[PDB]
Design a protein around this nucleic acid. Structure first.
Ligand code: MG
Ligand code: MG
Length: 95
RNA sequence: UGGCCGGCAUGGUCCCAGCCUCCUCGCUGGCGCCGGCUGGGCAACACCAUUGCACUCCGGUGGUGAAUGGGAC
């Protein structure tokens, strides 16, 4: 059951050996070109490691980001991207 | 020594270089041998497990079972 378009993209299959601060920075380095990014959430907990949430201001950016970077080698691993299931709080606090 | 004890061995104080380490990374730390008890913490590092949809920080285990020489008095 695929997911519907969202302001936020959910990425997984990320190298778990990368520290949080660096991961967010590197992610911003490659995704900022698709549009303004409101935030990038990363957690190294047992349940949230290897994944990240990049929150774009406009859905078209998320959609572009998703199509353009699907499978992109990042820290030696093919990035897997999908739309997030539900809106991030930062987005709800508006739209 | 992260805290603590037992056995044995061992002239001294320095000075230069090199090396070691999860627990006060460096020159007013340490760098003989053997044995046993034990605390903290996953922050760093490593290993194991994890492919996971969050917006509440939060899986486990291991390391000292470490490290040489030279010179001056
Ligand atoms: Mg020590
Ligand atoms: Mg950990």
């Amino acid at each position: 059951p695929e997911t519907r378009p969202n302001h936020t993209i959910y990425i997984n299959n990320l190298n778990e050996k990368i520290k949080k601060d660096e991961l967010k920075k590197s992610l911003h380095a490659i995704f900022s070109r698709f549009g303004q990014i409101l935030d990038i959430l990363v957690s190294r907990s047992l349940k949230m490691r290897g994944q990240a949430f990049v929150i774009f201001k406009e859905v078209s950016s998320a959609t572009n980001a998703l199509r353009s970077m699907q499978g992109f080698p990042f820290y030696d691993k093919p990035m897997r991207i999908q739309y997030a299931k539900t809106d991030s709080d930062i987005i709800a606090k508006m739209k």
